[PDB]
C-alpha cells in the first residue's frame, strides 16, 4: 500500500514540530561531525581510512577544481566543499537508514532552492568580480545583433541554479518514492539493486551538483 507524501515546508516560516527535513539534516550533520572527530584527534602522519576521507575526496576535489578552473577554485574552494560532504550525506541518511519512513513510531523544496540562491550569490558577488561589467558583456551591446539572446542566456543563468535545485529536490525525492513503491509491492528492495542504484544515483547527483556549481563559476569567469 503506497503511503508516500511530499514533505514540502517553508524555510522562511519557523520550523515545524516534526521538521523531517531539519531532523534529517541534523542527523547528517551529527554523522559528519562524528566522522570528523574520529579522524581529527586520531590522526597520524600517514593515517589509513581516517585521512583517506581528506585525501581521496577533499584533495581530489581540489585537484579536479584546479584542473577545471585553477586559482578561481581557491577563491570558491569552500563553495563546492560545502556542496560536497552534504546532500549526499543527507541522501545516505535518507536512504532508509533504519526506519526509512516505515514504522518510525535534499528533497525539501525550500532547502534546495535556498542552496540555489546561495549558488546565485557566487555569481552575485564573486561572479564577474574580476570585470564588474562582465554581466553586461555580449548582452544587447553594439554587437547585440549577434548577442540578442545574451540577456536570455543570463536569464538561463538565472534559471540554471534553480533548475539545479530541481535536480537536488528531484531524484532524491524520486528515490524515496521508488523505495516506498518497492515496499508496497515486490518487497525486500527489488530484483535490481534498488537500494544500491539509489545510493549510486544520489552520490552521482551530489557530485554532478558540485561540478555544475564549479562549471557555472567557470562560465561566469568567461
Amino acid at each position: 500500500h503506497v503511503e508516500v507524501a511530499a514533505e514540502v515546508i517553508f524555510d522562511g516560516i519557523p520550523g515545524f514540530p516534526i521538521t523531517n527535513s531539519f531532523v534529517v539534516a541534523i542527523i547528517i550533520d551529527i554523522f559528519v561531525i562524528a566522522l570528523a572527530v574520529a579522524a581529527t584527534r586520531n590522526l597520524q602522519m600517514v593515517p589509513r581510512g581516517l585521512q583517506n576521507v581528506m585525501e581521496f575526496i577533499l584533495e581530489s576535489l581540489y585537484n579536479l577544481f584546479r584542473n577545471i578552473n585553477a586559482k578561481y577554485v581557491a577563491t570558491a574552494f569552500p563553495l563546492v566543499a560545502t556542496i560536497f560532504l552534504f546532500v549526499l550525506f543527507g541522501n545516505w541518511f535518507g536512504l532508509l537508514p533504519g526506519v526509512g519512513s516505515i514504522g518510525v513510531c535534499a528533497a525539501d523544496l525550500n532547502f534546495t532552492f535556498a542552496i540555489a540562491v546561495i549558488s546565485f550569490v557566487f555569481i552575485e558577488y564573486w561572479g564577474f568580480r574580476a570585470l564588474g561589467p562582465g554581466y553586461l558583456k555580449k548582452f544587447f551591446n553594439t554587437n547585440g545583433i549577434m548577442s540578442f539572446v545574451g540577456i536570455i542566456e543570463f536569464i538561463s543563468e538565472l534559471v540554471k541554479p534553480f533548475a539545479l535545485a530541481f535536480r537536488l529536490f528531484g531524484n532524491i525525492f524520486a528515490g524515496e518514492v521508488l523505495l516506498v513503491v518497492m515496499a508496497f509491492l515486490v518487497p525486500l528492495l527489488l530484483p535490481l539493486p534498488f537500494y544500491g542504484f539509489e545510493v549510486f544515483v544520489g552520490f552521482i547527483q551530489a557530485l554532478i551538483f558540485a561540478l555544475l556549481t564549479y562549471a557555472f563559476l567557470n562560465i561566469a569567469v568567461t
Binding site: H1, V2, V4, N171, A174, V177, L178, V181, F184, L185, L192, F197, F200, V201, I204
Partner: peptide, 20 residues
Amino acid sequence: IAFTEALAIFGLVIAFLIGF
C-alpha cells in the same frame, strides 16, 4: 547506464503510483 536507468525508474515508478 546508471543515468539511463535513473531515467527508466523515473518513468517507471509513476506507473505504480497511478495504481495507488
